[PDB]
Design a protein around this ligand. Structure first.
Ligand SMILES: Nc1ncnc2c1ncn2[C@@H]1O[C@H](COP(=O)(O)OP(=O)(O)O)[C@@H](O)[C@H]1O
Ligand SMILES: Nc1ncnc2c1ncn2[C@@H]1O[C@H](COP(=O)(O)OP(=O)(O)O)[C@@H](O)[C@H]1O
Ligand SMILES: Nc1ncnc2c1ncn2[C@@H]1O[C@H](COP(=O)(O)OP(=O)(O)O)[C@@H](O)[C@H]1O
Ligand SMILES: Nc1ncnc2c1ncn2[C@@H]1O[C@H](COP(=O)(O)OP(=O)(O)O)[C@@H](O)[C@H]1O
Ligand SMILES: Nc1ncnc2c1ncn2[C@@H]1O[C@H](COP(=O)(O)OP(=O)(O)O)[C@@H](O)[C@H]1O
Ligand SMILES: [Mg+2]
Ligand SMILES: [Mg+2]
Ligand SMILES: [Mg+2]
Ligand SMILES: [Mg+2]
Lengths: 111, 526, 222, 118, 77, 77, 213, 98
């Protein structure tokens, strides 16, 4: 837009950082409710009536239809944890999102 | 009545018929638009244009070349189409004059518009223009000079002509450098006019001054896998054979047996046929083998075991240039090695240019072929450098063919205009007026040359006109300080072929455009 | 005398200023990805292919710039990536800045030809100056090589792993060249194999061969 | 090998300012423009580091005038210093090619006077 | 005034010229050229990283200097 | 606008102003030869120039002080 | 940069800003179009134009009068509007010269286009044109002759001027007839210049020579 | 001296182009007749003009071809004035049509 003339949109600065943190937070809030002996399961309906009940964070983030890249990153993170370890797929997503949140708080403080 | 403005329209839906004044109007405005477009690239201080095509690729070019500019524009005026084809033909005949012919035709048509406004028939104008073209041809031919006999003076003319051709182009930054290249590149041809022999490799990166003319030859092909990478005192077989699952040209031939054992025997026989082919090749006593076609894994292995560097997939151009630079014979049969001439070069190595490896032939035998490596900061810079080098090389080839030269810097145009003026003032009638207009267009060429630099075009063209009326037939523009000078001393000389072609093609196209009194367009397909 | 050349046409100046503005816009767009404290850009292709990067050549090639001058800056960064492989952002910033200066020069009423030639003069003098500043080095000076690699990595996301990837990046080059005779390097001799999983702390320098092709035998793996 | 941290750009700016003062004419203005244009890389490094670009670049110019031509922007300390102590070195070819290619592209772009829609 | 502008900064410049016309009745073109030049120079100053308010304050200071210098070199008729 | 070279003419008249103290040296727009405006009877009003400077500076201040815009942006009729 | 060819457009939807060369281009082509339109009506052998209005009435006029022709045309070029208003003002000031002034302005602008092409500033052009206007005014004034004293010579000048004015118009068929009419009609005013006093009744039928005062 | 001389020459060309057009409209050799007239007025025959009956040059005093000084002066001045105002234009800023 304007001087650049690139045929696309451009986010810059605190705006895009806030967007990335919002995306990661969204992904983490999807799965936060499925953590620990008191966590609960999720239904997922596949737009055709195909139903999937699950507590597995990697499964949940695989079935979702994500568009934001900062959220695709956390989905791939859960996938990688599921490939390399087999457990921790929810905790890793929550921890990555919280690290992003606090780190963006620090970057707002101009660290 | 009229074809269109008649009570009944006689045409299909979508066609049209521009009459006398409307036809000359469209013709003149289109031609003059084309001319005003392509000028400002004219002369040493000419500036480039951007060819931002709107296609699905959106190719981008930055050119000072009038021929490319006109080729790469969507024209809809028929007279403009005529001028476009004229510039294309100029680019085909010689390598220079593509902007000068266009501007000249446009100026002639501008003057013809002025004359038609004066209530002059567009037949009397063409008559006077033919007479003026004759007079100009004689003045040009009489002023031309030939120096092809004296080798040193001929070298001076070649250097000066290359300099004058590159002055207008992006290479004027390093004119002397590229001048030497261009001169050497045409002198390596040894009289031949084959410009396909001069290969130009454009390697992105580096400055334009990192460009050079390889003393040997360069090839952008690969060496085989288990085959050598360096060869001294290289004897070369240039070939156009199959060496790629080479099948007997009998096409009805088919292997029809009753046992896989026989299929395997026939496969082994095929391989033995390929091996015998490779052995016939090796009986030539070679270290390098270049094939126009591919070289499959088995002959590659055989050449590797034999210690022969087998370069594959060279093209028709690659093998022709190799034959020219090394002396070999492009061969497809090896049953009479005594008749196949081999190529020789003191060394074949692999060299790095930018990020790519190339085969370097040094110490070549003949040299009647060249490789120019063009370095640049942008692909647009590289393309424009190739176009400018092509201009210079084409002109130097045309001069080696015909050593006739004619001084530039507006000297030639002013001289022709002087001759036309002498003819005009002795002629009675409106043909004298059309001759005067011819002369005005000829004068408007150096006027534009001077304008493009920012000098007092009027003052300088007046000085030049006065000089050429006095008899100083060598007066021309000195564009360093912006004055008049001696083109013979400053080294501003052009190819007589190029200037004559400019004159004649411009006058001829203007003539054909001026004979038109009706434009009858048909319903466009679109 | 009196007055000079009227310059009856203004579109050339408009074109010059548009080119300068586009170039300066590109330069100021990527100015943020310069240096150790510079940050990365995400680029989502029309197909949706995401790319995070700090490389100027990659950034400019990946954002489908449309203005001609900006295209020329893209090609410029590519040429720097070829010739040096480092400096693809500095070169674009320098170009944008020289053009932004040409703005005020043109305004003063100087001809583009004079500006270009004077820039060539300054370029020759600057080549002289940089050559004077430089110090020679022997390729045996492994400390200088490690420091050059670390400097090259300080700008990139792999800078916390520089302690690991600087010695690998120097060993790799020092294994594919004869240090006594070498006048260049062919980086096709250095194969890079990107495999998902683990962390960047798991990168490895294999002196032998690595292949992604699968083994066909079952039971014979070693 | 050349120092980093914007030291070559700063030295370049300074010495071409001097060269420009020696080239009295209209080339002088253009050479001074080339210098002040090359002074933008250090300014950018400073801005991104989180420092005051104006003060940082003026301190750099002053220290390079004193004679410490290997002086640059230490983003670890946060100011100006001898940059070799942080071990910030880069090949001379990088800076030289950057300068050459940028200047060539600028000269090319200056020779343009029209745009056509082919 | 006759110019059909949609940019709010162009509207500010229209208001500026009209203001010069109201107070004085002459200079309506000098004011616009001068303001445009001041902003054109502020462009480079912001590029170098100075706070736009510091630019505005330096401009105010220099304007005071120029006004007093005008009072100084002035003549009487 | 008078065809002279801006930088050349301005630098020459600035140097002359500094050397021979004379704030009446300017641009010979009409090409009368002299650069002395006091001799050419080229005269402006002190309040005019002062108002130009003041208005330009104040509006440049209000413009540099703006760092956010929020237009309707609807592209309505 | 430029107002229109800037990264940001500063104008409302529908506006535009033609710059230096494009502005002179539109101006010169429009003025020269107006001039080439109104010429060919110039002089004794000038031919008339048809003013086939497209309104709901489709008014029809046949005129050799440049002022009427220019008033009755839909102009959209501003320079052409300037020339149109100029011819209207000529028709108001005096009753003749609207085509001579229009053609003259158009030819001056044609020559000015030629001069601008020669890389001349249109200030040097306007200066030289002012000097030329001075010289022309003096030459005209010096060549002018006055015969209002001699009554008979004044009558001859009046008859000759009326004849020269009607020569270009459709009345040149019966010029002498209408010449006498016009002269008598202006002499019956006895020095007054009130042209509202001269009533003209147009009665359809009869030949044009049946007209009388 | 100077390019003002060139602009004066163009002014003169337009003045000459008026009788040129007058002659064209009849079908005569406008160039020939205007050349004869220019030569006569350079010679000093300030009364030479076009005789449009036969298509020649003649004495306007005898043929009775006279105009009002008011009319010709106004023609000259208004034409030169409008050309001046049109030539001072270097920008046309149109507003969105109603
Ligand atoms: N019985 C338990 N008591 C307390 N904490 C538990 C218990 N089981 C699991 N947790 C905690 O809950 C966290 C997440 O467990 P869970 O959601 O089942 O696995 P994941 O995080 O891979 O989905 C673990 O970090 C673990 O510390
Ligand atoms: N040093 C010089 N002095 C004067 N004229 C020159 C000089 N160098 C080149 N020219 C002129 O510049 C012109 C360059 O024309 P060019 O752009 O090549 O035209 P075209 O594209 O039609 O071949 C030549 O016609 C030549 O007369
Ligand atoms: N640790 C450091 N401290 C200070 N300056 C550095 C450090 N590392 C790199 N630099 C400087 O920062 C710049 C980083 O440039 P970089 O973004 O890599 O340029 P490009 O992308 O054009 O190669 C280099 O020019 C170098 O001089
Ligand atoms: N005869 C002259 N000689 C030199 N400069 C002049 C002359 N007349 C006006 N100027 C200058 O031109 C500038 C513009 O003045 P003008 O266009 O009349 O009004 P405005 O200032 O509203 O544009 C003024 O600053 C003045 O200095
Ligand atoms: N008998 C004649 N011989 C030569 N010129 C004539 C004769 N009668 C008229 N004219 C010329 O014809 C012109 C008629 O012009 P006219 O169409 O009235 O112009 P406009 O409409 O501008 O007044 C006059 O300028 C006059 O000079
Ligand atoms: Mg678990
Ligand atoms: Mg050429
Ligand atoms: Mg780097
Ligand atoms: Mg009349």
């Amino acid at each position: 837009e304007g001087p650049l003339s690139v045929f696309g949109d451009r986010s810059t600065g605190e705006t895009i950082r806030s967007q990335n943190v919002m995306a990661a937070a969204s992904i983490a809030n999807i799965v936060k409710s499925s953590l620990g002996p008191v966590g609960l399961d999720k239904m997922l309906v596949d737009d055709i009536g195909d139903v999937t009940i699950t507590n597995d964070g990697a499964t949940i983030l695989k079935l979702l239809e994500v568009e934001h890249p900062a959220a695709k990153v956390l989905c791939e993170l859960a996938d990688l944890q599921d490939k390399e370890v087999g457990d921790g797929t929810t905790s890793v997503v929550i921890i990555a999102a919280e690290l992003l949140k606090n780190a963006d708080e620090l970057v707002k403080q101009k660290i | 009545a009229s074809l269109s403005l008649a009570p009944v329209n006689i045409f299909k839906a979508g066609a049209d018929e521009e009459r006398a004044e409307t036809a000359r109007l469209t013709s003149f405005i289109g031609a003059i638009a084309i001319g005003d477009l392509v000028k400002s690239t004219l002369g040493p201080k000419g500036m480039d244009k951007i060819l931002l095509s709107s296609g699905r690729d959106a190719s981008l070019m930055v050119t000072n070349d009038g021929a490319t500019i006109l080729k790469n524009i969507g024209v809809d005026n028929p007279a403009a189409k005529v001028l476009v084809d004229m510039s294309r033909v100029q680019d085909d005949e010689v390598g220079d004059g593509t902007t000068s012919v266009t501007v000249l035709a446009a100026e002639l048509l501008r003057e013809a518009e002025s004359l038609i406004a004066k209530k002059i028939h567009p037949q009397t104008i063409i008559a006077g223009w033919r007479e003026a073209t004759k007079a100009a041809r004689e003045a040009l031919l009489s002023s031309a000079v030939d120096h092809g006999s004296d080798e040193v003076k001929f070298r001076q003319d070649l250097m000066n002509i290359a300099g004058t051709t590159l002055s207008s182009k992006l290479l004027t930054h390093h004119k002397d450098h590229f001048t030497k290249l261009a001169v050497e590149a045409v002198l390596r041809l040894k009289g031949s006019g084959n410009l396909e022999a001069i290969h130009i490799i454009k390697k992105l990166g580096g400055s334009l001054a990192d460009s050079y003319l390889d003393e040997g030859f360069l090839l952008d092909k690969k060496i085989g896998v288990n085959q050598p990478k360096r060869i001294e005192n290289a004897k070369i077989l240039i070939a156009n054979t199959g060496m790629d699952t080479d099948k007997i040209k009998i096409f009805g031939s088919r292997v029809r047996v009753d046992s896989t054992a026989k299929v395997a025997e026939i496969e082994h026989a095929e391989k033995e046929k390929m091996k015998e082919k490779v052995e016939r090749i090796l009986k030539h006593g070679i270290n390098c083998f270049i094939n126009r076609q591919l070289i499959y894994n088995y002959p590659e292995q055989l050449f590797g075991a034999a210690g022969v560097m087998a370069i594959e997939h060279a093209d028709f151009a690659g093998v022709e240039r190799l034959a020219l630079v090394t002396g070999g014979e492009i061969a497809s049969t090896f049953d009479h090695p005594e008749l196949v001439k081999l190529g020789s070069c003191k060394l074949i190595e692999e060299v790095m240019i930018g990020e790519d490896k190339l085969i370097h032939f040094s110490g070549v035998a003949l040299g009647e072929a060249c490789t120019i490596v063009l370095r640049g900061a942008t692909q647009q810079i590289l393309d424009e450098a190739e176009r400018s080098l092509h201009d210079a090389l084409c002109v130097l080839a045309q001069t080696v063919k015909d050593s006739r030269t004619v001084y530039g810097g507006g000297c030639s145009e002013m001289l022709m205009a002087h001759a036309v003026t002498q003819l005009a003032n002795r002629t009675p009638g409106k043909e004298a007026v059309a001759m005067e207009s011819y002369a005005k267009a000829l004068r408007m060429l150096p006027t534009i040359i001077a304008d493009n630099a920012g000098y007092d075009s009027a003052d300088l063209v007046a000085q030049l006109r006065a000089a050429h009326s006095e008899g100083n037939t060598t007066a021309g523009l000195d564009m360093r300080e912006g004055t008049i000078g001696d083109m013979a001393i400053l080294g501003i000389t052009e190819s007589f072929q190029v200037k004559r072609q400019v004159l004649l093609s411009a006058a001829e196209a203007a003539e054909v455009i001026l004979r038109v009194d009706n434009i009858i367009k048909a319903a466009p397909r679109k | 005398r009196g007055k000079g050349a009227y310059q009856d046409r203004d579109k050339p100046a408009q074109i010059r200023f548009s080119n300068i503005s586009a170039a300066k816009a590109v330069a100021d767009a990527i100015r943020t990805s310069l240096g150790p404290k510079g940050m990365d850009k995400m680029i989502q292709d029309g197909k949706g292919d995401v790319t995070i990067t700090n490389d100027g050549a990659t950034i400019l090639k990946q954002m489908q710039v449309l203005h001609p001058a900006a295209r020329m800056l893209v090609e410029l960064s590519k040429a720097q990536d070829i010739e040096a492989g480092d400096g693809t952002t500095s070169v674009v910033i320098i170009a944008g800045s020289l053009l932004d200066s040409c703005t005020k020069l043109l305004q003063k009423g100087i001809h583009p030809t004079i500006i270009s030639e004077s820039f060539q003069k300054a370029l020759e003098k600057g080549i002289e100056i940089l050559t004077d500043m430089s110090r020679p080095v022997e390729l045996s000076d492994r400390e200088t090589l490690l420091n050059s690699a670390t400097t090259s990595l300080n700008s990139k996301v792999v800078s916390q792993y520089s302690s690991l990837l600087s010695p690998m990046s120097v060993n790799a080059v020092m294994k594919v060249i004869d240090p006594a005779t070498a006048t260049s390097v062919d980086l096709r001799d250095i194969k890079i194999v990107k495999k998902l999983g683990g962390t960047i702390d798991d990168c490895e320098l294999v002196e032998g061969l690595v292949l992604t092709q699968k083994v066909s035998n079952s039971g014979i793996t070693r | 090998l050349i120092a980093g941290g914007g030291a070559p750009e700063i030295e370049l700016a300074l010495r071409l300012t001097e060269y420009s003062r020696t080239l009295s004419g209209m080339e002088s203005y253009c050479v001074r423009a080339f210098a002040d244009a090359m002074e933008v890389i250090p300014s950018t490094l400073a801005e991104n580091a989180g420092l005051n670009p104006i003060s940082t670049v003026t301190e750099l110019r002053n220290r390079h005038a004193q004679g410490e031509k290997t002086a640059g922007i230490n983003v670890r300390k946060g100011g100006i210093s001898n940059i070799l102590e942080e071990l910030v070195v880069q090949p001379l070819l990088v800076s030289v090619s950057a300068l050459t290619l940028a200047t060539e592209t600028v000269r090319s772009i200056l020779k343009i006077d029209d745009v056509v829609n082919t | 005034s006759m110019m059909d502008v949609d940019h709010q900064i162009a509207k500010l410049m229209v208001e500026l010229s009209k203001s010069q016309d109201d107070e004085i009745g002459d200079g309506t073109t000098g004011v616009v050229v001068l303001a445009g030049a001041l902003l054109e120079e502020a462009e480079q100053l912001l590029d170098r990283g100075i706070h736009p308010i510091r630019i505005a304050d330096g401009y105010e200071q220099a304007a005071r200097v120029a006004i007093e210098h005008l009072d100084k070199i002035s003549d009487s008729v | 606008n008078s065809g002279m070279n801006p930088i050349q003419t301005m630098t020459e008249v600035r140097a002359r102003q500094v050397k021979e103290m004379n704030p009446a040296l300017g641009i010979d727009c009409l090409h009368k030869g002299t650069n002395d405006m006091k001799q050419q009877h080229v005269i402006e009003t002190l309040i005019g120039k002062k108002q130009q400077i003041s208005l330009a500076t104040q509006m440049v201040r209000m413009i540099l002080k703006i760092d956010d815009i929020r237009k309707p942006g609807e592209s309505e009729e």
